[PDB]
Amino acid sequence: MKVAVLGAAGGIGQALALLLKTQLPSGSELSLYDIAPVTPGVAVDLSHIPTAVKIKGFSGEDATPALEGADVVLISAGVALFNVNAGIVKNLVQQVAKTCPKACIGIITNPVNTTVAIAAEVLKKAGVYDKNKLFGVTTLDIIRSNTFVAELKGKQPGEVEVPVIGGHSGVTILPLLSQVPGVSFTEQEVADLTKRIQNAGTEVVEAKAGGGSATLSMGQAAARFGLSLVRALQGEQGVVECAYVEGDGQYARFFSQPLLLGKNGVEERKSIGTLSAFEQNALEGMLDTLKKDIALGQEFVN
Numbered sequence: 360m361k362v363a364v365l366g367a368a369g370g371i372g373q374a375l376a377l378l379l380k381t382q383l384p385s386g387s388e389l390s391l392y393d394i395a396p397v398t399p400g401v402a403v404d405l406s407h408i409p410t411a412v413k414i415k416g417f418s419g420e421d422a423t424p425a426l427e428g429a430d431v432v433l434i435s436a437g438v439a440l441f442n443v444n445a446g447i448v449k450n451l452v453q454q455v456a457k458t459c460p461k462a463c464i465g466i467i468t469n470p471v472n473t474t475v476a477i478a479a480e481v482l483k484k485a486g487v488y489d490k491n492k493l494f495g496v497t498t499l500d501i502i503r504s505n506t507f508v509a510e511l512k513g514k515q516p517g518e519v520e521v522p523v524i525g526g527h528s529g530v531t532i533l534p535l536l537s538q539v540p541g542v543s544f545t546e547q548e549v550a551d552l553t554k555r556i557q558n559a560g561t562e563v564v565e566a567k568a569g570g571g572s573a574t575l576s577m578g579q580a581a582a583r584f585g586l587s588l589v590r591a592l593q594g595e596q597g598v599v600e601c602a603y604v605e606g607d608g609q610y611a612r613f614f615s616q617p618l619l620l621g622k623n624g625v626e627e628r629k630s631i632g633t634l635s636a637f638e639q640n641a642l643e644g645m646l647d648t649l650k651k652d653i654a655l656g657q658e659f660v661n
């Protein structure tokens with residue numbers, strides 16, 4: 360199995376590449392690509408870590424050498440936004456559609472609500488789009504929910520898993536706090552937890568005082584989703600992760616929901632389950648923003 364990360368020189372890419380080099384199963388290959396000429400040296404530096412993962416870096420305009428034989432392509436390039444990131448997403452996904460068109464594509468570049476629709480429209484212009492292979496990485500909302508819920512209820516952070524559906528934008532992030540096993544929240548606890556999970560990025564941008572956004576936890580989030588897909592792509596069963604994908608269309612063309620992952624991408628789109636009165640109201644009131652964020656990306660290509 361080979362994983363290619365596009366945007367490896369940035370803060371998210373280097374954290375992503377570091378965690379993958381350490382956590383990818385033995386015999387895996389890791390290709391790093393970015394425009395900055397420092398990228399081959401990022402791989403050389405990571406190549407000194409004693410894990411059975413082959414790593415090589417590439418720079419320049421052409422990402423093809425890094426995409427050769429890629430099973431998973433994680434795109435973390437761009438700034439941490441539609442103005443400057445729409446062109447980078449369209450450019451990189453274009454090269455993916457020519458080199459490894461049947462790879463699993465994970466969009467980390469934000470706004471994920473919009474850039475995944477750009478990637479899909481670019482992929483279908485190449486006659487290549489497979490809605491089972493394109494994922495918007497929303498895992499940062501998952502791990503942020505686990506940290507806040509565990510701190511509130513005094514549980515161990517690694518033993519708390521809350522499902523998050525909807526989109527990646529603030530109002531679109533919907534944590535299903537009613538579905539957490541063994542935990543119950545008051546109606547005010549749900550309100551405070553939901554708003555903190557929806558504004559958790561501003562919490563980091565504010566504390567950094569303009570020096571950047573969440574770059575290490577986002578790398579940790581992209582690494583978790585990357586290894587989950589590699590496990591599924593290796594025949595591992597029961598691998599369930601929530602990701603922003605094009606599915607039923609019951610709420611929007613693209614919607615983050617539980618996904619049973621198999622050897623060809625998503626195996627089954629599991630239901631979002633039973634929703635509380637609060638979660639149902641938040642889902643409906645958010646839909647208008649999600650559809651506009653999707654329409655923005657579709658019109659950019661069309």
Ligand SMILES: [Ag+]
Pocket residue numbers: 430431461462463592623624
């Ligand atoms: Ag794949």
Ligand SMILES: [Ag+]
Pocket residue numbers: 461462463491492622623624
């Ligand atoms: Ag796939």
Ligand SMILES: [Ag+]
Pocket residue numbers: 501521522523524600601616617
């Ligand atoms: Ag979820």
Ligand SMILES: [Ag+]
Pocket residue numbers: 521522523599600601616617618
């Ligand atoms: Ag999930």
